[PDB]
Write an enzyme that holds these catalytic residues in place. Structure first.
Site, PDB file in Angstrom:
ATOM      1  CG  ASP A 223      57.643   8.263  21.346  1.00 45.61           C
ATOM      2  OD1 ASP A 223      58.755   8.832  21.374  1.00 45.61           O
ATOM      3  OD2 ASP A 223      56.796   8.463  20.448  1.00 45.61           O
ATOM      4  CD  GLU A 293      52.846   6.776  19.175  1.00 44.48           C
ATOM      5  OE1 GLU A 293      51.752   7.364  19.035  1.00 44.48           O
ATOM      6  OE2 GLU A 293      53.713   7.138  19.999  1.00 44.48           O
TER       7      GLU A 293
END
Ligand SMILES: *[C@@H]1O[C@H](CO)[C@@H](O)[C@H](O)[C@H]1NC(C)=O
Ligand SMILES: *[C@@H]1O[C@H](CO)[C@@H](O)[C@H](O)[C@H]1NC(C)=O
Ligand SMILES: *[C@@H]1O[C@H](CO)[C@@H](O)[C@H](O)[C@H]1NC(C)=O
Ligand SMILES: *[C@@H]1O[C@H](CO)[C@@H](O)[C@H](O)[C@H]1NC(C)=O
Ligand SMILES: *[C@@H]1O[C@H](CO)[C@@H](O)[C@H](O)[C@H]1NC(C)=O
Ligand SMILES: *[C@@H]1O[C@H](CO)[C@@H](O)[C@H](O)[C@H]1NC(C)=O
Ligand SMILES: *[C@@H]1O[C@H](CO)[C@@H](O)[C@H](O)[C@H]1NC(C)=O
Ligand SMILES: *[C@@H]1O[C@H](CO)[C@@H](O)[C@H](O)[C@H]1NC(C)=O
Ligand SMILES: [Ca+2]
Ligand SMILES: [Ca+2]
Lengths: 594, 594
Positions: A223, A293
Site C-alpha cells: 500500500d 502502488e
C-alpha cells in the site's frame, strides 16, 4: 534415409524448445477485478459485506473472464480507512468472516482457475497493536520498534522535534504520557509508523508475508512504499512559501517532502520483499505477484519500482494515472498513455486502471457516455487491465453520509454496495440499515437487468475480455499510436506473423468526423467494425474517408495486411512492445526469431 | 569387501568436495601496497616517476609478500590533483610512459603472480575533454552530457540557480560564454560533473571500463561515488547556521549536503558497475575487484556499499578510518575497530589502511615510535591490509613547496619520492630538479640501509606479511577483542581446529604494565613472543601477570589450547568472522561443518 530423418526431427524439436518464448504469467494475461470486501456481497445478514459473499458470487467473476481478484485490505483494523491501519496482521476482524471463511474462499478460487491478491500495509500499524502497547513500556525488543524521539511537552501543548506534517493533519509527532516521548506516525494520530531501520522489524514483516503465502494468497499488493523510511537527521523540511511565518504550516501541500518520502534504502527494502516471496515462487505454476502502488508522485519515480535488468524489484507498479483525470479529451488521454510507455523500461509489463477505492466513479467523474469508451481503452492497451468493482457497469457516486465509525467523508462515494438485483438494497444484503446506503438508481442499473437486455454496458465488458483473451494481438502485441489529436485517439495493435492488425479509434471529443486516410496508409475502401461501443453496429460497414462518431463512441477495426506499422521507418519511435515474438500460421507456435 | 570399500572412498571424496569452503580470492588474501606513479621510481630520467620505474622495482614488491598494487590514477589529466580531473580516459599522459609502457607493466606483474588495480574517476571530467568541448556547442548527443542550467550572467557577476557550493571553493555553478548556461562541477572550476541521468553517459562509462578490462587491469577502484547523482529539484540546501546572512556562505563545511550527496539511485549506478565487470570475472582465476572509496561520511553510510545478501554491489569499501586519527590511544583505536566490525554485514570482507595519498604520513602524524606498532595492527586484523607507498619504513612529511603546476598545497607532503638509495635524490631519479624535493633525512631512511641492518623497521614489515600469508589464523580466523582500555589494546585471533591462538597486545599508551591474567583465562606461567615490534624479544619468556611494555611496543603471543574465546558464552558479542570454517590436523583440508 530414415536414419537421417530421425535426427532431423530431434533437431526440429530442440529448435522449437529453444525458440519458444517464456509463457505469460497469470498476472500478465487476464484482467483483474478489484473487489471491496465490505461492499460486494453479504451472506450472514449483518449489514456489511464478507468474504463468504465473494465466494457465492465467484461464478459471476469468471463470467467476465477475470483472472485475478485483488481483494482490498481485510484485516483486524481499528481504523477501516486512512491507509487501513492494522492492529493484527495474523487475524481477521469479526467482519469478513473468520480465518476459516478466508481459507474456504481461496480454496474455491483455485478450483475455478482464478487467482487471488491481498493488500499489505507494512508501513504503519494501529495504536491497539500488541507491538505498540509493548513499545510504550520498553518491554524487551519492542522498545525500538517505532520511531521514538524525546520531545518537550509541558502544561499546555506539545512541541514536535521538527515541522514534519502528516498527510491527514498537523504535527506528525504526537506525545504519549506513558513513554514520555514523541512517536512518528505521518498518517494519523492512531497510526504509528513502524520503524524499518530496526533489523528485528524488517524480519517481522517477513514472517507476516510467509504466513499468508502458506495460506495461498498468490501474491501481495503493498500500500505505502514511499513512506517506509525517513531521514535519520530530524531536520526541517523546505517550505514552498519561503516568506511564510512558522507556527502556521499545517497542510501537507505547503511543504516539500524531501526527508519523509523516497529515502535512500527504501527500494532495498522493497527488493527484499521480492526475495522473500521468491522462495514460494519456485513452482512452475505458482508464481507470486508483488505490487508497490505508489500514488501521488511523478512518472520517473513510479517507473523506478519496475527494477533493474540485473535485479528484480516488482512486476509492475499500479498505474495511478487515468484515474485522477476528471476532464478527458484527445490530448489528456494521449499524454497519459505516452507518459507510461516512454518512461517504462523495455521488457516490463505495463498496467492500467480507470478507477479505484480512493477515486470517484467513472460515470460520476466523466459521464455515462464515457463508460463504454473507457472500458475499451482499458482492454485495448498492452498492460494488464485492472477493473474496480462495479466498474463494468455504470455505477454512480453516492452522497456523503454521516457514519458513526471513523471513515473519510471524501473518497467514500466509491464504497457503495454492489448493485446485484432490483430487490431491497439492490440485492446486496437481505438485512436492513446497511453500513452504506445503496445508490438510488439501482432499479435500472444492476447485473440482472443488464444481462437480460441487449446493447447494455455489461455485454461490452464481457466480449472485450473475451476478445482480449482469445485474440493474441491484444494479449502480446505491438502498440503503435498515431500522432496527437484533440478530438480522437487512434492506435494500432499488431504482431509479427499475424498478417492482421487491430485499429482502435476512440473519440473523446465532440461528435466529430474522422478521416482514416490521413492517419494510416494502405486501408481498403471498406472496413468492418469488429467491436462497436453501441452493439447495434458490430459487423457493419464503414468507409475510411468519413466516419460518424458520437461523443462516447469507440470502434475496433480488423484489417488483413502484411504492412505492419512497427516495420516502417516512420513508426519507429512510437511503437512499443514487451515480449517481441513472431507468430507462425503454418506451425501454430510462438517464435522469438523470425 | 573391496566392492564396499570402493564406494566408501567415492562417498568420502564427494563429501570433501561438498564440505570444502570457497577459496579466498586474490583480493581477500595478501596485502595491498598502494603506489603513487609519480613518486615511486623514474627510469627515462626526466624528473617524474613513470610506469616503467614500477616495473624495474617489481622484485621489491614481491619481497614484501604483496599481492595487489593499486596504482593511483594515471591518466591524461589537465589537473593532476583535486580528485584527478581526467581529460582522456582511453589515453595516458606524456608522463608515466605511453600505452605500450603500461601494457609491459601489467604483463610483467602477471608473470610474478601479482595483481593490479587502477583508480577510476567516473564522476567528473576535465574542461579540455572532447565531451565538454562538444557539449558547449550542442553538437549531437553530447548536448546533455553535463548538468546544464539556464542562469543569469550580466555585466558584473554570475548568479547560480541555488546556493550549492563546491568542495574546493564557492559557487558550484559556473557560467561559460559559449553555451550561455551554468554547468554543475561541484569540485573545481575545470572539473564539470558528468551528468549520469543520461542513459548515453551511463553507457559511455561501461565502454571505458571494458577498455581497461581487456588490457588486464584486474579490477578498478572508484574515486567519487557519493557525488555521482544530484537532486533534480534545484532547491537550496539547509544551512548549518540558520541566522546566517545569505550572499556569504562560501564554505563547504557550513552547509548540509542533502541534495548533492548520496541521492536516490546512486547505489543502482554502483550496482551496474559490478554487473559490467562481472562479464570479465567468469574465469576461475581472473576475478575483478571493485572499490567504492567513499570518504568523509558516517559509518552507516560506508557499510551500505557492501551490498545486500541478494545483490552484489562491491567487495569492500576502502576503510578511511585509522587515517584521520591524529592522536592514538587505547580508546581511539578500539572505537575504530569496533565501529567497522559491528556495522559491516556478516560474510563480507573488511579492510584497513593506515595512510594514503590524501593524508599525512604515519611517523609525521603519530610519531616514529608508533611506526612499528601500527604496522602490526594492520596485519593482525581480519581485513585486507592496505599499505601506502613508503609506509613500510618510516618516511616523514616534507614542507610545502611552490610548484608551477596546479597542485594542492596541503596533502602534498605525502607525495614525496620514494627513498630507495642514499645517492642523489635518494636514488629516485638520476636527473636534477625533480618534481618534488626528496625528504632531507634520506641518508638514514632508505630501503637499502634498512635491509642490511637488523632490528630495523623493514624486516618487521617483511615477516608480518610472511606470518599473515603462511599462518592460517591471520588469513581466515576469528577476531575476539578484550573489552576497552586506555593504555593497551588486546585481541585474540583464533580458528576452529587449529588448537592454537594468537594473542596480540598493542600498548598505544604511556609505558604501562599489563596483567594478562585479568583479561584472558587459562594462560600458562610463561608465554613466548612469536613476533615483537623491537626484533629482539622474538622468542623470549614473559609471565602473564606483569609485562613490561614501552610506549611504541607491541607483542604477539602464541598459546596452545582448545579453549577458544569465540566458543564461550561471554565472548559472543565481541567475536567476528567472515568465512566460518573448521581446520583439521589429521586431514589437512578446510571444513565448513565440524
Ligand atoms: C490541527 O489541530 C486542530 C486541533 O484538533 C484541529 O482542529 C485541526 O483540524 C488540525 N489541522 C488539520 C488540517 O486537520
Ligand atoms: C505566500 O507567498 C505569497 C507570495 O506570492 C505571499 O502571500 C506570502 O509570501 C505568503 N503568504 C502568507 C500569508 O504569508
Ligand atoms: C424487479 O425485476 C423484476 C423482473 O425484472 C420485475 O418483475 C419487478 O417488477 C422488479 N421489481 C422492482 C421493485 O423493481
Ligand atoms: C500536439 O502536442 C503539441 C504539444 O503537446 C501541441 O502543441 C499541439 O497543439 C498538439 N496538436 C494537436 C492537433 O492537438
Ligand atoms: C571565492 O571567489 C573568490 C574570487 O576568486 C576567491 O578569491 C575565493 O578564494 C573563493 N572562495 C574560496 C573558499 O575559495
Ligand atoms: C552563526 O551562529 C551564531 C550563533 O551561535 C551567531 O554568531 C550567528 O547566528 C551566526 N554567525 C553570523 C556571523 O551570522
Ligand atoms: C651511501 O651508502 C654507502 C654504503 O652504505 C656508503 O659507503 C656511502 O658512504 C654512503 N654515501 C652517502 C653520501 O651517504
Ligand atoms: C570504556 O568505554 C566507556 C564508554 O565508551 C567509557 O565510559 C569507559 O571509561 C571506558 N573504560 C576504560 C578503561 O577506558
Ligand atoms: Ca515510516
Ligand atoms: Ca555528479
Amino acid at each position: 534415409l530414415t536414419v537421417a530423418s530421425v535426427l532431423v526431427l530431434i533437431a526440429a524439436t530442440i529448435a522449437i524448445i529453444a525458440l519458444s518464448p517464456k509463457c505469460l504469467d497469470w498476472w500478465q494475461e487476464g484482467p483483474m477485478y478489484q473487489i471491496y470486501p465490505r461492499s460486494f456481497k453479504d451472506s450472514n445478514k449483518d449489514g456489511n459485506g464478507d468474504l463468504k459473499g465473494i465466494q457465492d458470487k465467484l461464478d459471476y467473476i469468471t463470467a467476465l473472464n477475470i483472472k485475478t481478484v485483488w481483494i482490498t485490505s481485510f484485516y483486524k483494523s481499528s481504523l477501516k480507512d486512512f491507509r487501513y491501519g492494522v492492529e493484527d496482521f495474523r487475524e481477521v476482524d469479526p467482519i469478513f468472516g473468520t480465518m476459516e471463511d478466508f481459507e474456504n474462499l481461496v480454496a474455491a478460487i483455485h478450483d475455478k482457475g482464478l487467482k487471488l491478491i491481498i493488500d499489505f500495509i507494512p508501513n504503519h500499524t494501529s495504536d491497539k497493536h500488541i507491538w505498540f502497547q509493548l513499545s510504550r513500556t520498553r518491554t524487551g525488543k519492542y522498545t525500538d520498534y517505532y520511531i521514538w524521539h524525546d520531545c518537550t511537552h509541558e502544561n499546555g501543548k506539545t512541541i514536535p522535534p521538527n515541522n514534519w506534517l502528516s498527510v491527514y493533519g498537523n504535527s506528525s509527532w504526537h506525545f504519549d504520557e506513558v513513554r514520555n516521548q514523541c512517536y512518528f506516525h505521518q498518517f494519523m494520530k492512531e497510526q504509528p509508523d513502524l520503524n524499518f531501520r530496526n533489523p528485528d522489524v524488517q524480519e517481522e514483516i517477513k514472517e507476516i508475508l510467509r504466513f499468508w503465502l502458506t495460506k495461498g494468497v498468490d501474491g501481495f499488493s503493498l500500500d505505502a512504499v514511499k513512506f517506509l523510511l525517513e531521514a535519520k537527521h530530524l531536520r526541517d523540511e523546505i517550505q514552498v512559501n519561503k516568506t511564510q511565518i512558522p507556527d502556521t504550516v499545517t497542510q501537507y501541500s505547503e511543504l516539500y517532502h524531501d526527508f519523509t518520502t523516497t529515502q535512500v534504502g527504501m527500494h532495498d527494502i522493497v527488493r527484499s520483499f521480492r526475495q522473500t516471496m521468491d522462495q514460494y515462487s519456485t513452482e512452475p505454476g505458482r508464481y507470486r505477484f508483488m505490487g508497490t502502488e505508489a500514488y501521488a508522485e511523478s512518472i520517473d519515480r513510479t517507473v523506478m519500482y519496475y527494477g533493474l535488468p540485473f535485479i528484480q524489484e516488482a512486476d509492475f507498479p499500479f498505474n495511478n494515472y487515468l484515474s485522477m483525470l476528471d476532464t478527458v479529451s484527445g490530448n489528456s488521454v494521449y499524454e497519459v498513455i505516452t507518459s507510461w510507455m516512454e518512461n517504462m523500461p523495455e521488457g516490463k509489463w505495463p498496467n492500467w486502471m480507470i478507477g479505484g477505492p480512493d477515486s470517484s466513479r467513472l460515470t460520476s467523474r466523466l459521464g455515462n457516455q464515457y463508460v463504454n469508451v473507457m472500458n475499451m481503452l482499458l482492454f485495448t492497451l498492452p498492460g494488464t487491465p485492472i477493473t474496480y468493482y462495479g466498474e463494468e457497469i455504470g455505477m454512480g457516486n453516492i452522497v456523503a453520509a454521516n457514519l458513526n465509525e471513523s471513515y473519510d467523508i471524501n473518497t467514500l462515494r466509491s464504497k457503495s454496495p454492489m448493485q446485484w438485483d432490483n430487490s431491497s438494497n439492490a440485492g446486496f444484503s437481505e438485512a436492513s440499515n446497511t453500513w452504506l446506503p445503496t445508490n438510488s438508481d439501482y432499479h435500472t442499473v444492476n447485473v440482472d437487468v443488464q444481462k437480460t437486455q441487449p446493447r447494455s454496458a455489461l455485454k461490452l465488458y464481457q466480449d472485450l475480455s473475451l476478445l482480449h483473451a482469445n485474440e493474441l494481438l491484444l494479449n502480446r502485441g505491438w502498440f503503435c499510436h498515431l500522432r496527437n489529436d484533440s478530438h480522437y485517439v487512434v492506435y494500432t495493435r499488431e504482431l509479427d506473423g499475424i498478417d492482421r492488425i487491430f485499429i482502435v479509434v476512440l473519440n473523446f471529443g465532440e461528435s466529430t468526423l474522422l478521416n482514416l486516410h490521413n492517419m494510416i496508409s494502405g486501408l481498403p475502401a471498406k472496413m468492418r467494425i469488429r467491436l462497436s461501443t453501441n452493439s447495434a453496429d458490430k459487423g457493419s460497414k464503414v468507409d475510411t474517408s468519413g466516419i460518424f462518431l458520437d461523443k462516447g463512441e469507440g470502434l475496433i477495426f480488423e484489417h488483413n495486411t502484411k504492412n505492419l506499422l512497427h516495420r516502417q521507418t516512420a513508426f519507429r519511435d512510437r511503437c512499443f512492445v514487451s515480449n517481441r515474438a513472431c507468430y507462425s500460421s503454418v506451425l501454430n507456435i510462438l517464435y522469438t526469431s523470425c
